[model samples]
Target: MTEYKLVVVGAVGVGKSALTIQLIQNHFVDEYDPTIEDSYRKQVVIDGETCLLDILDTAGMRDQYMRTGEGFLCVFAINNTKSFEDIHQYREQIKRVKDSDDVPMVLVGNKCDLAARTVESRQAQDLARSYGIPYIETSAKTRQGVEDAFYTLVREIRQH
Candidate 1:
């Protein structure tokens, strides 16, 4: 089995934990403290291939960087626009730690079910393209594109 370190990051109240839980366990917690530290290691099979996913569900701490081995960085944002804005900082941290721009990353805009509170999907897509990362809109509440997002990231990393 291949090993991969997947990091989930975002600002406070951006639903990073929610998305992580929904993707890994197919469940979402309505009440989660953003200040808590959490991490999980699990195995996921994609395309009949087993891969170990070491998920680091990081807190909303500024000026902190986490290292990873053969992994994917998932920068997720909920309905809040500030979460989307923090992607730049997360990218910088990834570079500072990984020291490479070639690392695989996925920009996830969560809470897509709340379209009335969304901040233009095209804008997020444009930013993802500018940063050379794949983009996906996910809704943990409805499980929309949740599996696809992580599966696509894993597939991309395997191809490299």
Candidate 2:
């Protein structure tokens, strides 16, 4: 999935922008300020080869974007129950758009840097396992697991 366009989506305030900004710029973002549409190009070495990843971020991301995506990174706030629950809906949308459930996907529980997570890591892992997708915990403010999430999704796509 290196040299691919990965579509990222989630509910409002789910840290989609923050994760994208952190992944591309190597800096953590603390604000909720986010654009409606943004694209990021970053050189990441995958499987001993450098490939470019263009990340598209936003909420009104329709099937048209999903149609063009080789993989997906669906995010949710680990402390927000509703946001965690809504991730399934987003994943379902991807399946509907791609007309298959075999899309390479990574479910991210963001804001893990925060204390007292309402959605446990095991909970998120169980959900991802249900769909046979990988689950990653990330903290936009601390920048933890940010790269792993992106790299894991890309490699997952690369395998298929």
Candidate 3:
């Protein structure tokens, strides 16, 4: 059994809280507003290994917390291109704060259920490929790929 500390970062209203809350509470909040009250810890078995996950939902001490984070879910709304662009900044900041290029992380495209997607899957895939990380599409509303996104991060952290 082991513990993994994870962090969720992205531009505002990118559904970071929705994603985290969905993973922890198994419910979705459609009108959530960001607050310090969003952190959570959950216990589950991943790939046969018992694991504890501490997830912080944020859109930071802002950088100091990244220093302590073992893995990150860099989320962006597929319907919002601005949010997608902001992912680059967050990725660079995380690497800068962690001072390493090989940090465990995942690129997440949220709101996949929406048909107004402005950021195509291929763009996200190319970005993740450049970063050498996994890219996952999720819909917190329908709970699609939510577990896969978080569990994949744990797997990456374990393999890292």
Candidate 4:
């Protein structure tokens, strides 16, 4: 078994925390303390092997959370263009902190349940393709594509 340190990063209101709770606890949380940094642990079978995933949900602010992450989830809300723009900064910061372009990562477009999306899917996919990473869309409300996002990160780390 392997343990993966996964950090979830995104701008405020991007649903990073919500997606994490949905994946770990199997529920869509309406509200949580955004000021506090949080961590969660889960054990699951991925590709016929049980692995423990350690998730760090950021406080939606800038800080040193990027230092110890083995893999990162660069998330953005499809409804907020600013949040999507901030994803590039988060991705660069992780690469700087890890000092490796080979860092495993996944670009996440969250809040896909919203119909009034400002950031188009093709835009996000283009960014991920440029980085040579995977892009996944998730709606924490309906739990759509939640597991795939996290599991894909673990698989990325394993392959790395």
User: Which candidate leads the pack in TM-score?
Assistant: 3
Clashing pairs in 4: none
Candidates 3 and 4 compared by TM-score, better number? 3
The sequence of per-residue lDDT tens digits that candidate 4 reaches over residues 4-45 is 899998888889889999999999989856747889998988
Better of 1 and 3 by TM-score: 3
Candidates 2 and 4: which is better by TM-score? 4
Q: Tens digit of lDDT per residue, candidate 2, span 107-126?
A: 99999988878999899999
Q: How far is candidate 4 from the true structure (C-alpha RMSD, Å)?
A: 1.4
Question: Which of the two, 1 or 3, has more lDDT?
Answer: 3
Tens-digit lDDT track for model 3 on 12-93? 8888888888888999998956655356888998898888899977642677666789999999999999999888899999
The C-alpha stretches of model 4 lying farther than 4 A from their native spots are 61-63
Quantify how close model 2 is to the true structure by its C-alpha RMSD in Å.
1.7
| Candidate 4 Cα deviation (angstroms), residue 143 | 0.7
Candidate 4 least-lDDT 10 residues: 59-68
User: What is every candidate's alpha-carbon RMSD to the true fold?
Assistant: 2.1, 1.7, 1.3, 1.4
TM-score of each prediction: 0.88, 0.93, 0.95, 0.94
lDDT of 1 by residue, 1-160 (tens): 7887777777777777787888878797789686566777788787898878877777864224366545555555556877788888878787777788887788888888885565687898898899777788888788898888878778767766
